[PDB]
A paper describes a structure:
Among these channels, the Stelar K+ outward rectifier channel (SKOR) functions as a K+ efflux channel for long-distance distribution of K+ from roots to the upper parts of the plant. Each protomer can be arbitrarily divided into four layers along the central axis: a transmembrane domain (TMD) comprising six transmembrane α-helices designated as S1–S6, a gating ring formed by the C-linker, a cytoplasmic domain homologous with the cyclic nucleotide-binding domain (CNBD), and an ANK domain. Unlike the canonical potassium channel, SKOR does not adopt a C4 but a C2 symmetry, which occurs in the C-linker, CNBD and ANK domain.
After extensive 3D classification and refinement, two final maps of SKOR (named SKORwt1 and SKORwt2) with global resolutions of 3.1 Å and 3.5 Å were obtained. Interestingly, the overall architectures of both SKORwt1 and SKORwt2 do not adopt canonical C4 symmetry but exhibit a dramatic reduction of symmetry from C4 to C2. In the structure of SKORwt1, four ANK domains are divided into two pairs; the two ANK domains in each pair form close contacts with each other, and a gap is present between the two pairs, resulting in a C2 symmetry. As a result of this asymmetry, the inter-CNBD interactions around the channel ring differ considerably. Compared to KAT1, SKORwt1 exhibits a significant rotation in the C-linker and CNBD. Notably, as a depolarization-activated channel, SKOR was expected to adopt an open conformation in vitro (0 mV) like Kv1.311 and hERG channels, but both SKORwt1 and SKORwt2 were found to be in a closed state.
Author numbering:
A (entry chain B): 208 to 436, 439 to 449, 462 to 621
B (entry chain A): 74 to 451, 461 to 522, 529 to 621
C (entry chain C): 208 to 451, 461 to 522, 529 to 621
Write the structure that this text describes.
């Protein structure tokens, strides 16, 4: 039960057991005194007992509550290993029972001490925090530096201390089926409204939200190094040459254009950052060919306010054209085998009928090459050029 | 309203702590041994209450401590709300006199039980340990040990006063049934037990409590009747848990470690490491010497400062290493921007006397700044603090001509060769000053230094042209954003457009347009880049 | 011995030593009483002893069995540091022995406590479980997770409390090469019984056992929902599952394979009926294995048949198109002169000598764009030079 302190419930359990074995031993020790006839009272631990003035002459009809406390008083004194000698065993049957009870309590008594020491040594989470502070403070006075940087040092370690709830958690133990549902309820709103993924496919955004890994960075920390070769997302806060607004992704251009980041990212304040592996993004985007093209299309449209995009427009324009030409290459391949199911999807997902591959060819040439009339009227109804000219001067009417 | 940091109210708190110690150690004594508090102590009893009385009204002047995390709210309504809801009722009841009330209501024993409410103010002493526990000057585990000893020795004092009370709650005619009434030491009888020169009546009671508290056990003094056995059971059982709690905190103090324990572990690995590699006996004398050097005069305690971020640690280096660097003759008149780039990438090392850092004819791979101690160069020279040695070798590529010998315990700052040249190249203007200052082989070094800065401008032009010749777009990209001007030409004169147009590389031609490189640049031949295409 | 804990054995050894020294010290102590003349027995610890009514006067013909217990009773009381004073040393030669026995036992007594603490400090199942719940409760509170999800995460943590699981973070020290053989020992028999892998090659199946994972699900949980996109493939090894009731899932079966092949959303909801043990396989890993084993891939589609015609046609169309697509990728790389791009698809890709749908060897594109460097590479593969497209042209005709 987490709601109950563990040290408290271990002491009570051990105290109850030790106080119960003492209670049972007290009742047994009085029984050994009644196993001898009433004429031999002088050979018992209680029949031959004389306190300050009481006599315990017969130890029968002695007002049992008076007859029980004295037996319990003897039992708790030997339980704590104090020892008085006013009450002790006299005959064999009480000496033998004393040995098997004193020795039993020794093992149980050392078990309590060894059980409480282990929990004291195993300190709490806050206990280990203060231990690290002492070393830093002791080293701080060894040099006797200024006061301005002391606040930054104390604040830095405290900030990560309180934000380390997600740092190396046990969520990896949970099955991935349950863990996938958790990510779709926490990160999905943030990844939905980022301008980069505007107009992207719903299935594409579901495969990108699973791989997120949140992280908290203290202000002043270097997220990335300028002129050096993981995608990042921001949730709240501000990042720092330039200031990053919330819901804005940085490092997308570096991965897409294969250029190391030219500015070092420094945290302006305490911000929550979600990080995605650079290799994961490339592999994920490869599967969704249709959706990946719309990504850099939105990035290219952003060359209005940002100056970095404007000076990188030429290189970006090459990637979209190269990828767009690849789409037209697959369009002719599908029309080659006459499988109209694939043609409809490709042309509807931004495909164009007047699309030419590198070697001047068009889907119309492939449509009439195999004599497939089913796809022939599809492109004609799509307002395509019947007299489109290729490099080798083979019109669609010619090769047919 | 006054914040709890006025340095005058804080001195008032330390003044009431003395009364808290006195009134907590005197209340059990008055309750048990005394039966009316005779007039000799009348002034002290009255004086103690008024000292706590002025505090019960001064508590409203204190503003607050914190609302959720840290918030000092100075409001009359806010301050009084917490006081009257937590401990005001107990504080008022404890300060109200009970000795005069006991004698003003006949002789009622049940009204003297209220006198034990004053035992609560010992909590003020406990709060002092908690406040002092957060102090960083003294270890907190050691403070926690002292707190447990005070609590254990205070419960022993209280249990001694209660035990004597259980002997006075029986009629004088039945004093033979009490633990002290029937007591008889060597010759003393303790017969009357009620006029026994109290100072030797309290020690006997305390002697019983201390023996029981330490679980020694003599049997000369022990409980006899029923009401003293029950109290002994609950006192012994309570102390058993408290006794095992002290041992637990005592172990935690030791388990943290010590300088000797950490040093002993390091020597175990080093001795094992050197034995398996069969190192020479001379080297074994140096490695073991440096470990004892850091044993005393505790070092920086590595693997701890690494948690500090590099951005903060960058400012730390400037505060410490800057004053020593500025005094070297080599960096006289250098720009602050250049020097700042050196302080960031320095390391601190110690060398015992008699050690050797450089040997004659050896290749210098590090640059050292002397900050402490004295060194002797071999005797042909003596090295003083705020100096640097080995700079001749690293600049002229000459093998080290002299051997540097440590004379006294010295602290040395070292700089690597790779890091030095990268910093020097960027600060081209500062680099010329370093060579000029070093002059004040010298002519050859000066000529080479002037020749080194002259050649580097031409060499970078060749590297760009070679990349453009072979069409490696990525190779030339690194030397454009952080390199040289692509518009410049090499010794013969070869713009990258010339080579690109000669090899028909269309893709590279687009990028050169983005840099607005001039098109009509002519080499020493009369040709144009368009003539090669 | 590994069957029993070594720390617990060390505790028993110390108890035996302490109880044996007590037995020896009891016999030695009585000897110090018999080393004095019988006329001076009043100066011994037992000769002058007098309990309740017994006198211990003669002490030399006293029915030994009641002479040893009274001597062992002294030693046990001293050993446990209780102390009564009814039996104690009196003369000089018994005080000296008592000092060395008490001092020796004090060190031995504190040694037992040290080993008792080390046993507890190792930990326990409850202690480790309690620490995990502290983080999970703190993690869920800060993210404001729904009350329904909190009932599932806490359920799985309590599930692994009893019936101790693999106790992860310890098996990672095992090398992957050895752990590879461990998987074939355990998971292999369960896979072979699925209808989907009937007649499959042993090489193909072996590539699946290596990359499987183990998961447990409590009764009443939901693994798949209607209309959801399947991202994992599950093999049922234990328990029983019910598909929604329209079907019942038995052990040695696999579910969700329809969605991962035809790209159809999951049509049925899979609910756990009894405590089940499930082996899962990812989508990315499954497709990479399937592509290499092209022959085995056809068998899986054929076995699944025994929308079905469309899936069968698509499966036959999928294996047909992949051979043509890789040809296009090579030609595109050669067209743009990316040497490194085409390097990866030569050693582990397709034959560069093959042509695309129209027919265009990479030598044609290389000769058309004047890329001299790539031409040397094609010579190393001994690609035929006189290959002709469906136009009558030659690679040399483009140059």
């Amino acid at each position: 039960d987490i709601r109950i302190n563990y040290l408290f419930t271990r002491i009570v359990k051990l105290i109850f057991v030790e106080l119960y074995c003492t209670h049972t031993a007290a009742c047994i020790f009085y029984y050994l005194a009644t196993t001898l006839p009433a004429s031999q009272e002088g050979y018992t631990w209680i029949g031959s007992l004389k306190l300050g003035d009481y006599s315990y002459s017969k130890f029968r009809e002695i007002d049992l509550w008076t007859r029980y406390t004295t037996s319990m008083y003897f039992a708790v004194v030997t339980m704590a290993t104090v020892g008085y000698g006013d009450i002790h065993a006299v005959n064999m049957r009480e000496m033998i029972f004393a040995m098997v009870y004193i020795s039993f309590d020794m093992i149980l008594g050392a078990y309590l001490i060894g059980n409480m020491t282990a929990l004291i040594v195993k300190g709490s989470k806050t206990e280990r925090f203060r231990d690290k502070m002492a070393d830093i403070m002791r080293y701080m006075n060894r040099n006797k530096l200024g006061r301005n940087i002391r606040g930054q040092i104390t604040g830095h370690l405290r900030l990560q201390y309180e934000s380390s709830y997600t740092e190396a958690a046990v969520l990896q133990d949970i099955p991935v089926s349950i863990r996938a549902k958790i990510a779709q309820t926490l990160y999905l709103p943030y990844i939905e409204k980022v301008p980069l993924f505007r107009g992207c496919s719903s299935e594409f955004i579901n495969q990108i939200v699973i791989r997120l890994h949140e992280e908290f960075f203290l202000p002043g920390e270097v997220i990335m190094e300028q002129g050096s070769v993981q995608l990042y997302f921001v949730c709240h806060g501000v990042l720092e040459v330039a200031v990053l607004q919330p819901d804005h992704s940085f490092g997308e251009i570096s991965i897409l254009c294969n250029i190391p980041q030219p500015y070092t990212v420094r945290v302006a304040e305490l911000c929550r950052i979600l990080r995605l592996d650079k290799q994961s993004f490339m592999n994920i985007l490869e599967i969704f060919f249709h959706d990946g093209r719309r990504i850099l299309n939105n990035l290219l449209e952003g060359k209005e306010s940002n100056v970095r995009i404007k000076q990188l427009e030429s290189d970006i324009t090459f990637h979209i054209s190269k990828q767009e030409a690849e789409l037209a290459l697959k369009l002719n391949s599908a029309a080659f085998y006459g499988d109209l199911y694939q043609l409809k999807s490709l042309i509807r997902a931004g495909g164009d009928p007047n699309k030419t591959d590198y070697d001047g060819r068009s889907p119309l040439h492939l449509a009439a090459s195999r004599g497939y009339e089913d796809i022939t009227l599809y492109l004609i109804q799509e307002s395509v050029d019947v007299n489109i000219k290729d490099k080798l001067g083979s019109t669609p009417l010619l090769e047919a | 309203i006054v914040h709890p940091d006025n340095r005058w109210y804080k001195a008032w708190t330390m003044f009431i702590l003395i009364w808290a110690l006195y009134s907590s150690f005197f209340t059990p004594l008055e309750f048990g041994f005394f039966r009316g508090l005779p007039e000799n102590l009348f002034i002290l009893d009255i004086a103690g209450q008024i000292a706590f009385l002025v505090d019960i009204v001064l508590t409203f002047f204190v503003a607050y401590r914190d609302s959720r995390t840290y918030r000092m709210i100075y409001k009359r309504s806010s301050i009084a709300l917490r006081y009257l809801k937590s401990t005001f009722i107990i504080d008022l009841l404890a300060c109200m006199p009970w000795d005069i009330i006991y004698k003003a209501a006949g002789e009622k024993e049940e009204v003297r039980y209220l006198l034990l409410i004053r035992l609560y103010r010992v909590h003020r002493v406990i709060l002092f340990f908690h406040k002092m526990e957060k102090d960083i000057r003294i270890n907190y585990l050691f403070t926690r040990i002292v707190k447990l000893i005070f609590v254990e020795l205070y419960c022993t004092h209280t249990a001694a006063c209660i035990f004597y009370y259980l002997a006075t709650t029986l009629p004088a005619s039945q004093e033979g049934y009490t633990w002290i009434g029937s007591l008889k030491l060597g010759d003393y009888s303790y017969s009357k037990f009620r006029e026994i020169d109290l100072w030797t009546r309290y020690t006997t009671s305390m002697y019983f409590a201390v023996v029981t508290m330490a679980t020694v056990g003599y049997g000369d003094i022990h409980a006899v009747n029923m009401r003293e056995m029950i109290f002994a059971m609950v006192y012994i059982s309570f102390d058993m848990i408290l006794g095992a709690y002290l041992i637990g905190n005592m172990t935690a103090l030791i388990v943290k470690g010590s300088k000797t324990e950490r040093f002993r572990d390091k020597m175990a690995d080093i001795m094992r490491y050197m034995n398996r590699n069969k190192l020479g006996r001379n080297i074994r004398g140096q490695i073991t010497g440096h470990l004892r050097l850091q044993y005393e005069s505790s070092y920086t305690e590595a693997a701890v400062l690494q948690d500090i971020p590099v951005s903060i640690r960058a400012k730390i280096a400037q505060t410490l290493y800057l004053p020593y660097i500025e005094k070297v003759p080599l960096f006289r008149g250098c720009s602050s921007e250049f020097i700042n780039q050196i302080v960031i990438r320095l390391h601190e090392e110690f060398f015992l006397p008699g050690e050797v850092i450089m040997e004659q004819g050896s290749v210098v791979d590090q640059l050292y700044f002397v900050c402490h101690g004295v060194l002797e160069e071999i005797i042909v020279a003596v090295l003083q603090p705020d100096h640097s040695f080995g700079e001749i070798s690293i600049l002229c590529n000459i093998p080290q001509p002299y051997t540097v010998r440590v004379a006294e315990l010295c602290r040395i700052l070292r700089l690597d060769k790779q890091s030095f040249m990268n910093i020097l190249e960027i600060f081209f203007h500062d680099g010329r000053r370093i060579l000029n200052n070093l002059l004040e082989r010298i002519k050859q070094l000066e000529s080479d230094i002037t020749f080194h800065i002259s050649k580097q401008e031409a060499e970078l032009a060749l590297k760009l042209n070679s990349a453009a010749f072979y069409g490696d777009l990525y190779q030339l990209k690194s030397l454009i954003r952080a390199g040289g001007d692509p518009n410049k030409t090499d010794y013969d004169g070869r713009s990258p457009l010339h080579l690109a147009a000669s090899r028909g590389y269309e893709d590279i031609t687009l990028y050169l347009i983005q840099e607005s490189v001039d098109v009509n640049i002519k080499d020493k031949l009369g040709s144009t880049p368009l003539l090669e295409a």
